[PDB]
Amino acid sequence: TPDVFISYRRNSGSQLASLLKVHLQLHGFSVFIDVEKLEAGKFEDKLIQSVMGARNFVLVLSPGALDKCMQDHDCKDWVHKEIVTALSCGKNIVPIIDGFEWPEPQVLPEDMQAVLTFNGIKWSHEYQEATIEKIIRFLQ
Amino acid sequence: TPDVFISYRRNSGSQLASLLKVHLQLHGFSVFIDVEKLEAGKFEDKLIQSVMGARNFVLVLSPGALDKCMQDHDCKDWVHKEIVTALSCGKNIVPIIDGFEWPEPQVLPEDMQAVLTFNGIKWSHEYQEATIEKIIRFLQ
Numbered sequence A, B: 001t002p003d004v005f006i007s008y009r010r011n012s013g014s015q016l017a018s019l020l021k022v023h024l025q026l027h028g029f030s031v032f033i034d035v036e037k038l039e040a041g042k043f044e045d046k047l048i049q050s051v052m053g054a055r056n057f058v059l060v061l062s063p064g065a066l067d068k069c070m071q072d073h074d075c076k077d078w079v080h081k082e083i084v085t086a087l088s089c090g091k092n093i094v095p096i097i098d099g100f101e102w103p104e105p106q107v108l109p110e111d112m113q114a115v116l117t118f119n120g121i122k123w124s125h126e127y128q129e130a131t132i133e134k135i136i137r138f139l140q
Protein backbone atom coordinates (compact mmCIF):
# COMPACT_ATOMS: atom_id res chain seq x y z
CA THR A 1 0.00 0.00 0.00
CA PRO A 2 1.71 3.18 -1.17
CA ASP A 3 1.49 6.30 0.99
CA VAL A 4 1.55 8.70 -1.98
CA PHE A 5 -0.35 8.67 -5.28
CA ILE A 6 1.06 10.99 -7.96
CA SER A 7 -1.48 12.29 -10.49
CA TYR A 8 -0.05 14.12 -13.49
CA ARG A 9 -0.48 14.94 -17.16
CA ARG A 10 1.82 12.91 -19.40
CA ASN A 11 2.34 15.59 -22.01
CA SER A 12 3.27 18.32 -19.49
CA GLY A 13 4.13 16.87 -16.06
CA SER A 14 5.85 13.52 -16.67
CA GLN A 15 9.29 14.82 -15.71
CA LEU A 16 8.17 16.67 -12.58
CA ALA A 17 6.02 13.71 -11.51
CA SER A 18 9.07 11.45 -11.89
CA LEU A 19 11.24 13.91 -9.96
CA LEU A 20 8.69 14.06 -7.14
CA LYS A 21 8.69 10.26 -7.09
CA VAL A 22 12.47 10.03 -6.66
CA HIS A 23 12.63 12.60 -3.84
CA LEU A 24 9.66 11.17 -1.93
CA GLN A 25 11.12 7.66 -2.12
CA LEU A 26 14.47 8.93 -0.85
CA HIS A 27 12.58 10.31 2.16
CA GLY A 28 11.00 6.94 2.98
CA PHE A 29 7.62 7.23 1.27
CA SER A 30 6.11 4.45 -0.80
CA VAL A 31 4.97 6.14 -4.01
CA PHE A 32 2.54 5.12 -6.72
CA ILE A 33 3.20 6.55 -10.15
CA ASP A 34 1.66 4.67 -13.05
CA VAL A 35 4.83 3.91 -15.01
CA GLU A 36 6.40 2.29 -11.94
CA LYS A 37 3.48 0.52 -10.21
CA LEU A 38 0.47 0.22 -12.55
CA GLU A 39 0.76 -3.44 -13.43
CA ALA A 40 -1.33 -6.20 -14.95
CA GLY A 41 -5.09 -6.17 -15.32
CA LYS A 42 -7.86 -3.76 -16.18
CA PHE A 43 -6.27 -0.39 -15.52
CA GLU A 44 -9.41 1.68 -14.88
CA ASP A 45 -10.16 -0.21 -11.65
CA LYS A 46 -6.48 -0.60 -10.74
CA LEU A 47 -5.91 3.17 -10.95
CA ILE A 48 -9.02 3.98 -8.88
CA GLN A 49 -8.04 1.49 -6.17
CA SER A 50 -4.50 2.89 -6.06
CA VAL A 51 -5.85 6.38 -5.39
CA MET A 52 -8.09 4.97 -2.68
CA GLY A 53 -5.22 3.07 -1.10
CA ALA A 54 -2.86 6.03 -0.72
CA ARG A 55 -3.23 8.52 2.12
CA ASN A 56 -1.64 11.36 0.16
CA PHE A 57 -2.69 12.53 -3.31
CA VAL A 58 0.04 14.65 -4.98
CA LEU A 59 -1.42 16.47 -8.01
CA VAL A 60 1.07 17.87 -10.57
CA LEU A 61 -0.45 21.12 -11.87
CA SER A 62 1.71 21.72 -14.93
CA PRO A 63 0.49 24.33 -17.45
CA GLY A 64 -2.88 23.32 -18.86
CA ALA A 65 -2.98 20.24 -16.64
CA LEU A 66 -6.75 20.57 -16.09
CA ASP A 67 -7.64 21.50 -19.69
CA LYS A 68 -8.80 18.00 -20.66
CA CYS A 69 -10.97 18.02 -17.51
CA MET A 70 -13.06 20.93 -18.77
CA GLN A 71 -16.49 19.87 -20.09
CA ASP A 72 -15.55 16.27 -19.16
CA HIS A 73 -18.85 15.79 -17.38
CA ASP A 74 -18.88 12.09 -18.29
CA CYS A 75 -15.65 11.84 -16.23
CA LYS A 76 -13.64 9.99 -18.87
CA ASP A 77 -10.51 12.13 -18.48
CA TRP A 78 -8.11 10.28 -16.25
CA VAL A 79 -6.80 13.20 -14.22
CA HIS A 80 -10.42 14.17 -13.69
CA LYS A 81 -11.24 10.62 -12.52
CA GLU A 82 -8.24 10.55 -10.17
CA ILE A 83 -9.10 13.93 -8.61
CA VAL A 84 -12.75 12.97 -8.10
CA THR A 85 -11.60 9.77 -6.42
CA ALA A 86 -9.21 11.73 -4.18
CA LEU A 87 -11.92 14.26 -3.29
CA SER A 88 -14.57 11.61 -2.65
CA CYS A 89 -12.25 9.66 -0.34
CA GLY A 90 -11.20 12.71 1.68
CA LYS A 91 -7.57 12.28 0.69
CA ASN A 92 -4.82 14.63 1.77
CA ILE A 93 -4.58 16.46 -1.56
CA VAL A 94 -1.31 18.31 -2.14
CA PRO A 95 -1.28 20.17 -5.48
CA ILE A 96 2.10 21.09 -6.96
CA ILE A 97 2.03 24.35 -8.89
CA ASP A 98 4.38 24.33 -11.90
CA GLY A 99 3.31 27.13 -14.22
CA PHE A 100 -0.36 26.40 -13.56
CA GLU A 101 -2.83 29.22 -14.22
CA TRP A 102 -5.56 29.23 -11.57
CA PRO A 103 -8.84 28.85 -13.50
CA GLU A 104 -12.22 30.23 -12.60
CA PRO A 105 -13.95 27.35 -10.74
CA GLN A 106 -16.99 27.37 -13.03
CA VAL A 107 -15.01 26.08 -16.04
CA LEU A 108 -14.39 22.71 -14.27
CA PRO A 109 -16.97 19.96 -13.70
CA GLU A 110 -18.77 20.45 -10.38
CA ASP A 111 -17.44 17.16 -9.02
CA MET A 112 -13.83 18.41 -9.05
CA GLN A 113 -14.06 22.18 -8.42
CA ALA A 114 -13.10 21.53 -4.79
CA VAL A 115 -9.54 20.62 -5.86
CA LEU A 116 -8.81 24.34 -6.30
CA THR A 117 -9.59 24.91 -2.58
CA PHE A 118 -6.57 22.90 -1.40
CA ASN A 119 -3.36 24.67 -0.44
CA GLY A 120 -0.86 24.25 -3.28
CA ILE A 121 2.93 24.17 -3.23
CA LYS A 122 4.81 26.25 -5.77
CA TRP A 123 7.54 24.33 -7.56
CA SER A 124 10.74 26.41 -7.39
CA HIS A 125 13.38 25.47 -9.97
CA GLU A 126 15.89 27.58 -8.05
CA TYR A 127 14.95 26.17 -4.59
CA GLN A 128 14.03 22.54 -5.27
CA GLU A 129 15.36 21.16 -1.98
CA ALA A 130 13.17 23.66 -0.11
CA THR A 131 10.18 22.77 -2.29
CA ILE A 132 10.69 19.08 -1.51
CA GLU A 133 11.08 19.75 2.22
CA LYS A 134 7.76 21.63 2.15
CA ILE A 135 6.01 18.82 0.26
CA ILE A 136 7.22 16.39 2.93
CA ARG A 137 5.79 18.71 5.60
CA PHE A 138 2.40 18.55 3.84
CA LEU A 139 2.37 14.74 3.69
CA GLN A 140 0.64 12.62 6.33
CA THR B 1 35.61 20.03 -9.89
CA PRO B 2 32.31 18.35 -10.81
CA ASP B 3 32.56 15.32 -13.09
CA VAL B 4 29.35 16.15 -15.00
CA PHE B 5 28.03 19.40 -16.48
CA ILE B 6 24.31 19.41 -17.38
CA SER B 7 23.37 21.80 -20.20
CA TYR B 8 19.67 22.39 -20.74
CA ARG B 9 16.95 24.77 -21.88
CA ARG B 10 15.08 26.38 -19.00
CA ASN B 11 11.76 26.61 -20.82
CA SER B 12 11.57 22.94 -21.87
CA GLY B 13 14.20 20.91 -20.02
CA SER B 14 14.44 22.17 -16.42
CA GLN B 15 12.64 19.19 -14.91
CA LEU B 16 14.58 16.53 -16.83
CA ALA B 17 17.84 18.34 -16.04
CA SER B 18 17.08 18.28 -12.31
CA LEU B 19 15.90 14.67 -12.58
CA LEU B 20 19.18 13.77 -14.25
CA LYS B 21 21.12 15.64 -11.55
CA VAL B 22 19.40 13.72 -8.72
CA HIS B 23 20.00 10.32 -10.32
CA LEU B 24 23.62 10.98 -11.21
CA GLN B 25 24.41 12.17 -7.66
CA LEU B 26 22.70 9.08 -6.25
CA HIS B 27 25.16 7.02 -8.31
CA GLY B 28 28.17 8.96 -7.01
CA PHE B 29 28.87 11.59 -9.69
CA SER B 30 29.60 15.18 -8.85
CA VAL B 31 27.22 17.20 -11.02
CA PHE B 32 27.10 20.85 -12.06
CA ILE B 33 23.69 22.26 -12.80
CA ASP B 34 23.41 26.01 -12.67
CA VAL B 35 20.65 26.29 -10.05
CA GLU B 36 22.76 24.27 -7.62
CA LYS B 37 26.38 25.19 -8.34
CA LEU B 38 26.49 28.50 -10.26
CA GLU B 39 27.43 30.81 -7.41
CA ALA B 40 28.90 34.29 -7.03
CA GLY B 41 30.54 36.38 -9.72
CA LYS B 42 30.43 37.05 -13.44
CA PHE B 43 28.45 34.08 -14.67
CA GLU B 44 29.81 34.20 -18.22
CA ASP B 45 33.22 33.15 -16.94
CA LYS B 46 31.93 30.79 -14.24
CA LEU B 47 29.69 28.83 -16.62
CA ILE B 48 32.41 28.38 -19.24
CA GLN B 49 34.89 27.41 -16.50
CA SER B 50 32.45 24.82 -15.20
CA VAL B 51 32.05 23.27 -18.68
CA MET B 52 35.82 23.22 -19.14
CA GLY B 53 36.28 21.54 -15.77
CA ALA B 54 33.81 18.67 -16.16
CA ARG B 55 34.81 15.45 -17.90
CA ASN B 56 31.24 14.71 -19.03
CA PHE B 57 28.84 17.07 -20.79
CA VAL B 58 25.24 15.89 -20.48
CA LEU B 59 23.07 17.80 -22.95
CA VAL B 60 19.33 17.75 -22.45
CA LEU B 61 17.69 17.75 -25.87
CA SER B 62 14.12 18.62 -24.97
CA PRO B 63 11.81 19.62 -27.85
CA GLY B 64 13.29 22.58 -29.67
CA ALA B 65 16.29 22.73 -27.36
CA LEU B 66 18.62 23.96 -30.13
CA ASP B 67 16.12 26.39 -31.70
CA LYS B 68 17.73 29.42 -30.05
CA CYS B 69 21.16 28.28 -31.29
CA MET B 70 20.05 28.57 -34.90
CA GLN B 71 21.46 31.69 -36.59
CA ASP B 72 23.24 32.64 -33.34
CA HIS B 73 26.41 33.29 -35.26
CA ASP B 74 27.76 35.76 -32.64
CA CYS B 75 27.41 32.90 -30.11
CA LYS B 76 25.20 34.82 -27.67
CA ASP B 77 22.90 31.89 -26.84
CA TRP B 78 23.90 30.07 -23.71
CA VAL B 79 23.31 26.49 -24.79
CA HIS B 80 25.25 27.37 -27.92
CA LYS B 81 28.19 28.67 -25.83
CA GLU B 82 28.14 25.63 -23.57
CA ILE B 83 28.09 23.20 -26.50
CA VAL B 84 30.95 24.98 -28.27
CA THR B 85 32.96 24.94 -25.04
CA ALA B 86 32.27 21.19 -24.63
CA LEU B 87 33.19 20.47 -28.26
CA SER B 88 36.36 22.60 -28.04
CA CYS B 89 37.59 20.85 -24.89
CA GLY B 90 36.91 17.37 -26.27
CA LYS B 91 34.52 16.57 -23.45
CA ASN B 92 32.52 13.36 -23.26
CA ILE B 93 29.29 14.71 -24.75
CA VAL B 94 26.18 12.67 -23.89
CA PRO B 95 22.97 14.04 -25.46
CA ILE B 96 19.75 12.96 -23.74
CA ILE B 97 16.92 12.81 -26.28
CA ASP B 98 13.46 13.78 -24.95
CA GLY B 99 11.12 14.37 -27.88
CA PHE B 100 13.91 16.18 -29.71
CA GLU B 101 13.66 16.21 -33.51
CA TRP B 102 16.93 15.80 -35.35
CA PRO B 103 17.60 18.88 -37.50
CA GLU B 104 19.63 19.04 -40.65
CA PRO B 105 23.18 20.01 -39.58
CA GLN B 106 23.19 23.08 -41.84
CA VAL B 107 20.52 24.84 -39.76
CA LEU B 108 23.02 25.08 -36.86
CA PRO B 109 26.12 27.28 -36.57
CA GLU B 110 29.13 25.47 -37.99
CA ASP B 111 30.94 25.63 -34.65
CA MET B 112 28.35 23.33 -33.03
CA GLN B 113 27.13 21.08 -35.85
CA ALA B 114 29.45 18.37 -34.50
CA VAL B 115 27.14 17.87 -31.53
CA LEU B 116 24.77 15.87 -33.73
CA THR B 117 27.49 13.25 -34.34
CA PHE B 118 27.45 12.12 -30.70
CA ASN B 119 25.51 9.01 -29.70
CA GLY B 120 22.43 10.19 -27.77
CA ILE B 121 20.33 8.34 -25.19
CA LYS B 122 16.55 8.20 -25.63
CA TRP B 123 14.75 9.30 -22.46
CA SER B 124 12.12 6.62 -21.76
CA HIS B 125 9.33 7.65 -19.38
CA GLU B 126 8.36 3.97 -18.99
CA TYR B 127 11.94 2.66 -18.47
CA GLN B 128 13.62 5.43 -16.49
CA GLU B 129 15.91 3.27 -14.35
CA ALA B 130 17.12 1.61 -17.54
CA THR B 131 17.68 5.02 -19.14
CA ILE B 132 19.69 6.14 -16.12
CA GLU B 133 21.74 2.95 -16.13
CA LYS B 134 22.56 3.57 -19.79
CA ILE B 135 23.60 7.13 -19.00
CA ILE B 136 25.94 5.97 -16.23
CA ARG B 137 27.43 3.52 -18.75
CA PHE B 138 28.18 6.46 -21.08
CA LEU B 139 29.91 8.56 -18.40
CA GLN B 140 33.60 8.21 -17.58
Ligand SMILES: CN(Cc1cc[n+]([C@@H]2O[C@H](COP(=O)(O)OP(=O)(O)OC[C@H]3O[C@@H](n4cnc5c(N)ncnc54)[C@H](O)[C@@H]3O)[C@@H](O)[C@H]2O)cc1)C(=O)NCC(F)(F)F
Pocket (backbone or CB within 6 Å): A006, A007, A008, A009, A010, A011, A033, A034, A035, A036, A038, A039, A043, A047, A068, A078, A079, A082, B126
Ligand atom coordinates in the same frame (compact mmCIF):
# COMPACT_ATOMS: atom_id res chain seq x y z
C1 LIG C 1 -3.11 2.25 -19.00
N1 LIG C 1 -2.37 3.43 -19.46
C2 LIG C 1 -3.12 4.69 -19.90
C3 LIG C 1 -3.19 5.63 -18.69
C4 LIG C 1 -2.58 5.28 -17.48
C5 LIG C 1 -2.66 6.19 -16.40
N2 LIG C 1 -3.32 7.36 -16.53
C6 LIG C 1 -3.43 8.24 -15.41
O1 LIG C 1 -3.93 9.38 -15.79
C7 LIG C 1 -2.78 10.38 -15.73
C8 LIG C 1 -2.23 10.59 -16.99
O2 LIG C 1 -3.28 11.12 -17.74
P1 LIG C 1 -3.04 11.63 -19.26
O3 LIG C 1 -4.30 12.30 -19.75
O4 LIG C 1 -1.84 12.51 -19.32
O5 LIG C 1 -2.69 10.27 -20.10
P2 LIG C 1 -3.48 9.85 -21.46
O6 LIG C 1 -2.98 10.76 -22.58
O7 LIG C 1 -4.92 10.02 -21.26
O8 LIG C 1 -3.17 8.26 -21.78
C9 LIG C 1 -3.31 7.90 -23.18
C10 LIG C 1 -2.00 7.42 -23.56
O9 LIG C 1 -1.76 5.95 -22.77
C11 LIG C 1 -1.67 5.01 -23.69
N3 LIG C 1 -2.59 3.93 -23.48
C12 LIG C 1 -3.92 3.89 -23.77
N4 LIG C 1 -4.42 2.69 -23.43
C13 LIG C 1 -3.38 1.94 -22.94
C14 LIG C 1 -3.24 0.62 -22.43
N5 LIG C 1 -4.40 -0.30 -22.35
N6 LIG C 1 -2.02 0.20 -22.01
C15 LIG C 1 -0.97 1.00 -22.06
N7 LIG C 1 -1.04 2.25 -22.53
C16 LIG C 1 -2.25 2.73 -22.98
C17 LIG C 1 -1.92 5.70 -25.13
O10 LIG C 1 -0.92 5.45 -25.92
C18 LIG C 1 -1.98 7.25 -24.88
O11 LIG C 1 -0.80 7.89 -25.45
C19 LIG C 1 -1.75 9.76 -14.70
O12 LIG C 1 -2.06 10.39 -13.37
C20 LIG C 1 -1.95 8.50 -14.74
O13 LIG C 1 -1.97 7.81 -13.44
C21 LIG C 1 -3.91 7.70 -17.67
C22 LIG C 1 -3.87 6.84 -18.80
C23 LIG C 1 -0.88 3.44 -19.50
O14 LIG C 1 -0.30 4.44 -19.87
N8 LIG C 1 -0.15 2.28 -19.08
C24 LIG C 1 1.32 2.33 -19.14
C25 LIG C 1 1.87 2.55 -17.70
F1 LIG C 1 1.38 1.59 -16.86
F2 LIG C 1 3.24 2.47 -17.72
F3 LIG C 1 1.45 3.77 -17.24
Ligand SMILES: CN(Cc1cc[n+]([C@@H]2O[C@H](COP(=O)(O)OP(=O)(O)OC[C@H]3O[C@@H](n4cnc5c(N)ncnc54)[C@H](O)[C@@H]3O)[C@@H](O)[C@H]2O)cc1)C(=O)NCC(F)(F)F
Pocket (backbone or CB within 6 Å): A126, B006, B007, B008, B009, B010, B011, B034, B035, B036, B038, B039, B043, B047, B068, B078, B079, B082
Ligand atom coordinates in the same frame (compact mmCIF):
# COMPACT_ATOMS: atom_id res chain seq x y z
C1 LIG D 1 23.04 33.84 -14.55
N1 LIG D 1 21.79 33.21 -14.98
C2 LIG D 1 21.34 33.20 -16.44
C3 LIG D 1 21.77 31.89 -17.08
C4 LIG D 1 22.46 30.91 -16.36
C5 LIG D 1 22.82 29.70 -17.00
N2 LIG D 1 22.51 29.50 -18.27
C6 LIG D 1 22.93 28.30 -18.92
O1 LIG D 1 22.48 28.20 -20.14
C7 LIG D 1 21.40 27.14 -20.09
C8 LIG D 1 20.14 27.75 -19.95
O2 LIG D 1 19.94 28.46 -21.12
P1 LIG D 1 18.52 29.19 -21.41
O3 LIG D 1 18.43 29.81 -22.79
O4 LIG D 1 17.38 28.26 -21.11
O5 LIG D 1 18.56 30.36 -20.24
P2 LIG D 1 17.62 31.69 -20.30
O6 LIG D 1 16.21 31.30 -20.18
O7 LIG D 1 17.90 32.47 -21.59
O8 LIG D 1 18.07 32.66 -19.04
C9 LIG D 1 17.46 33.97 -19.09
C10 LIG D 1 16.77 34.11 -17.82
O9 LIG D 1 17.96 34.09 -16.63
C11 LIG D 1 17.72 35.08 -15.81
N3 LIG D 1 18.87 35.93 -15.71
C12 LIG D 1 19.40 36.74 -16.66
N4 LIG D 1 20.48 37.35 -16.13
C13 LIG D 1 20.62 36.93 -14.83
C14 LIG D 1 21.53 37.18 -13.76
N5 LIG D 1 22.67 38.13 -13.90
N6 LIG D 1 21.35 36.54 -12.58
C15 LIG D 1 20.35 35.69 -12.40
N7 LIG D 1 19.47 35.42 -13.38
C16 LIG D 1 19.61 36.04 -14.59
C17 LIG D 1 16.42 35.85 -16.35
O10 LIG D 1 15.39 35.53 -15.62
C18 LIG D 1 16.17 35.29 -17.79
O11 LIG D 1 14.76 35.07 -18.00
C19 LIG D 1 21.82 26.21 -18.88
O12 LIG D 1 22.57 25.03 -19.44
C20 LIG D 1 22.52 26.94 -18.10
O13 LIG D 1 23.77 26.32 -17.63
C21 LIG D 1 21.87 30.44 -18.99
C22 LIG D 1 21.46 31.66 -18.42
C23 LIG D 1 20.92 32.53 -13.99
O14 LIG D 1 19.90 32.01 -14.36
N8 LIG D 1 21.36 32.52 -12.61
C24 LIG D 1 20.50 31.87 -11.63
C25 LIG D 1 21.09 30.46 -11.31
F1 LIG D 1 22.38 30.54 -10.89
F2 LIG D 1 20.33 29.89 -10.32
F3 LIG D 1 21.06 29.71 -12.47
